């Protein structure tokens, strides 16, 4: 409770923001000055890692320390799924948020990290209620949609948030203490969570959107859809005029319901990263 609520709070305190994937301090500075609520330090970029296909690991501290020494706003970093020692090494680094990110090469195909044992807040991907709950029950402070990272395609990210919202609800308007008991056991999670969700109609944690956000339009689409905030990563920086696009997205995320404003910031944006349409995977 006390320990948790503090973690959730830090995460919860990021509501309405935009986190940005940064590769270098230069990039970090651009992101802070653009309105980013935080930055994700990493030495190589989602849209490149998904082609390599080399092992993608925790990023080198020096690299991170630098990025995190050149900005006021908090700094996130990535660790491989199940790679608790990588996480240990980053709690030590005094990073702000850790992200057990499925976009890197997993380290345990069977066990995620025991995030409870850490004092730093974690962020985790989910594509559905169960998965969401399992990660939360596992000690996840914050949650984001998975989506197809690096693709440039919202199709996925959106579908997820829809499902979670659809699932939370479906399961919600159902009947029996036993009916639930089952669903809790099924998705391998304490009855107490599934329950706080139904009693609150929403996860206990902040639910951000990640993977496939390339346009201000997209960002806004995901808030209108329910998300609590937005992860963009490159290719903001893989675009023609990053600084501009970066701001467009931050602005698009705060005013996500201002057709007039939205449009204003969606004009003369330049050429954006050529995504890879999910379908054609």
């Amino acid at each position: 409770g006390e320990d948790f609520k503090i973690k959730s709070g830090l995460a919860q305190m990021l509501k309405g923001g935009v986190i940005m994937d940064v590769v270098t301090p230069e990039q970090a500075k651009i992101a802070e000055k653009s309105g980013a609520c935080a930055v994700m330090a990493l030495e190589s970029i989602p849209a490149d890692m998904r082609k390599s296909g080399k092992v993608c690991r925790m990023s080198d501290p020096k690299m991170i320390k630098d990025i995190m020494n050149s900005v006021s706003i908090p700094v996130m970093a990535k660790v491989r799924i199940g790679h608790f020692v990588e996480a240990q090494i980053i709690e030590a680094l005094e990073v702000d948020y850790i992200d057990e990110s499925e976009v890197l090469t997993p380290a345990d195909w069977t066990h995620h990290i025991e995030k409870d044992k850490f004092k730093v807040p974690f962020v985790c991907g989910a594509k559905d209620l169960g998965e969401a709950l399992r990660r939360i029950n596992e000690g996840a402070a914050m949650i984001r949609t998975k989506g197809e990272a690096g693709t440039g395609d919202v199709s996925e990210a959106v579908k997820h948030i829809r499902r979670i919202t659809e699932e939370i609800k479906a399961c919600q308007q159902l009947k029996s203490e036993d009916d639930i008991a089952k669903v809790a056991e099924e998705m391998r999670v304490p009855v107490s969570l599934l329950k706080d969700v139904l009693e609150k109609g929403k996860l206990p944690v902040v639910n951000f959107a990640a993977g496939g956000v390339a346009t201000p339009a997209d960002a806004a689409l995901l808030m209108q859809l329910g998300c609590d905030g937005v992860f963009v990563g490159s290719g903001i920086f893989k675009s023609s005029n990053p600084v501009r696009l970066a701001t467009a997205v931050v602005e698009a995320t705060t005013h996500f319901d201002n057709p007039s404003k939205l449009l204003e910031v969606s004009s003369d944006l330049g050429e954006l990263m050529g995504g890879v349409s999910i379908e054609s995977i």
Copy 2:
């Protein structure tokens, strides 16, 4: 009723016309002066997007504003399927017609746009009655055949209009209030629509032909077949002598029953885009 019958009216008012895909103001002006009833502004061309295969998104407003600031006739633009925010941004732009076009990379594989909530008229693709009705019931002001966009092959476009006409009719000359009730539920649409169709023998909206029109001959073939108007897009402009072909098609569409005239405008036309025969897909 009232609100819609206005949207219908804008669409309905294009009867007999030819809408043209434009990529630049220069191209727009050529189209207008050619007899186009309107133009579809887009930064990249159906016949190229279907090869990329990059994510195809709403086009950049500046781009559109420009195209739409250089012509009297109305201007359409495209948004991804289900991407309501993209649409919101374009209502704002004050475009004339929006096209929720399946030729771009979809944004929701499960939900189209809630076009009712918009005041701008939408246009949608259909390959059959059900699909048609679903899009209309969803708020579609105007409807077009899908066909294989960019292929240069009528085979598809025609087949669709045939089916819709064949289906409208088949379902029409059938018997029981319950018989219908079923078909309405099946194609997931209010009994009231399927009904206005059967009572009128035709959709409540204008039904244009799109995808696979490359020759004046083709355009005429589709009107003789029942369509209310024609979408061409590039490769009018991917042809040897656009200006000439553009006019040929506009002319072929108005006089679509004048063998003498038709032929006149089908001569010395030059080399047209080398399509990609559906079959060989």
Copy 3:
């Protein structure tokens, strides 16, 4: 009857001849002077179209007008299957025979043209009795074997004529008015045709050979086999010494039973188009 018999007559009046695929007036003149009973005007050649694989359409009138303004003998042109407007445009052109040719990209995968409604004689491909009858019942004035066009291989052409002759006969020496009634309904045709065939032992129309004729020898082989005449197309012109080969085939077709003469015209012929053996498809 009256209207039909006139059409059949024009077609019937081509018996024993050789029709040649021409691409340019030069080529047309060569063909006339060679003994061709007619020429097929087209802007691109069977043996190339079957590789493209671009949409193959009706040819540009100017092109045809030219070819047909440089020769006394009649001129045929091609239109896509089911593309009635294309045909309309060519009746208008005052071409002599129209060929609803399956070698082009079809326009209707479900419906051929309503050739009845036209006053110009049509020619159609068939690979068997049923198909033959269906085209004839559909208004076909003349009929040709399909064969594998552009391949340079007789295997197919021959097989067809064999089958038609084999089928006409098989069905012929069978018993009951009901026995027939069935076969008529099966191959979706009026009992009256199947009947005139059996009563005459041959279709009511001329049956030419097309697709896969590359050598004088081949032409002769197809007449000995029953055909009423021969379509060659390129690669007469894709050969080393066209003029010579053209004549050889015209001559081989008239004297198709003159081993001495046949051989005379099959010598020092030069290098002919390198076909593509059906088998290796």
Copy 4:
């Protein structure tokens, strides 16, 4: 009887010989001077045709006339399976033997030639008794094994002669007039042939070996095995020292039981065509 027994005689008179594939007069003269009992005139070579894969046809007469005007020994030529007119053209040419050769692109996948109607002796491939009998019953004067032509591999040729010899025999030592009646109908042939075979223990015609003979050793192997003579074709000429190899094979075929002599002629032979091992097909 009479007519045939003359054709049989011309074929039968080649017993013990070697027929050679020639492509040019120069090649023909080399073959004659080497001891070839005859030559097979063709403009392109088995080992190349089986790669093309272009349509392989009867060869141009001039070509043949030339080859056959530069040698005393008889001259064979090829025609496509079922291509009776091609054959007609070659009877006319006054060639000595015609070979309805399956190595060329067939002209009728359903009917071989009616060799009875010809006065020139035919040669045909067979891989088994039935096939052999069918070709003979069809008017075949001479028969050869098929084998994988152009491969350089005896595996096949041998296997065939084994089977025919194995089959002739198997069927031979069986019992009932009805037992046979069946086998005759099965392999679609008059009871009278199957019968003359069993009563004589061998086909009524000469049975040569063809396809896959590359070495003197091979030739001898096939005679020891029962064949009545040998078809070699290139790559005698695709070898390093043709003249020598040609003679080696002729000599190896006559003295096919003289280990001492065989070996003598198998030495310092040079590099022979690099076959293509059946297996690796």
Copy 5:
């Protein structure tokens, strides 16, 4: 008992250490001076052999003698599975530990080596309890996880140690002398071993981690997980700054529970070998 407990002792004495793959003396000396408890002499490197795909054999003695003559710490060498003579040759060489390594091309797909008959201690790979026990029962002095060698990916190595630990335990807390009897026979091993394991909760031998260790972080992760020591091999040396990385790993392995220290040694490490993510196999 006695004989083995000596071999066990040599292996057991390496507890807590790091063994390193060396390819040359220069490399050996770097490894020794780095803190390596031993080195694995081999002429070609795991990450290259798994691409070749040439036969990978015991390494040439001279090569090894040299490597083992330039370092105080013990020296291991590899032999192919089942290749007892290769092993014999290396006992003779007076190497310290032999590794019957599945990373080389096996020599017997059916029988491992009879390591009992040797006086030198062997090391063997296992992915599960059974496999582990079978190798031990076979005379294995030391055991290591297999993991995907040369990949750079821990996913595997970890998964193994998890399973073994999971299996040892699962089987442990089960009930009947017969229950066990079965499992012993199943995994084809004496009841006496499975038993010493359950009675001790751990194998009788040291269990190192191998295959997929590329980062100090990884090494530490595997000790935290239960391993008794670490095999790294190249690409320590396939990295940018080997010396540094080598030390980092040795240090990371001893202080594998010192987040502060761990992180200290994980900074400014340079570019490491670009692994090949298991998944993408």
Copy 6:
């Protein structure tokens, strides 16, 4: 008996030796002077033939005569499976041993050679008892393991000898005269052989190892395993320092149980042929 025992004797007289694949007299001399008990004359090399994939035939006599005229020790040569005439030609040549070798392109997929009819001793490949017996029953004087020739991989060779030894034994300690009767009929061989084997516990002929021997270590491994002698072929000569390796293998074969000696001869051997690991086939 008498005739056989003489053949077996010559073969039997090769016990403990190493036969070497030679391509040229130079190579032959090197092999003799190295300690080879005999040489296998061939114009092209196992490790190359298995890539070609051209037909591999008996080698040209001159070639062999030369090789066999430049060495005292006996000389073997290869013939294709079932190619009895090739064998006849080589008996004539006065070669010492003939090898009906499956490494060349077979000549009869159904019948091996009737080696009984020859006075020269034959050698044959086998992978199991049955196969061994069938070849012996067929007149085989000597037998060798097959293994994957040219691969450089012992995996196979060893596996075979294991099986034969395993099979001989398995079948041996079984019960009934009828029990055996079956196994004899099954593996298509006289009860009398299977019987002499069981009564002697070993084939009546010498059993050498062949295919996949690349290292002295390998050779020794195969003797320890039961073989009576060793076929190496290239790539002894495809190695860096043939002369040395050749001797190493001869020496390794005689002293195959002298770890000290074995190792001595396995040092500073140079780079050996890069095999092709069976597995990766």
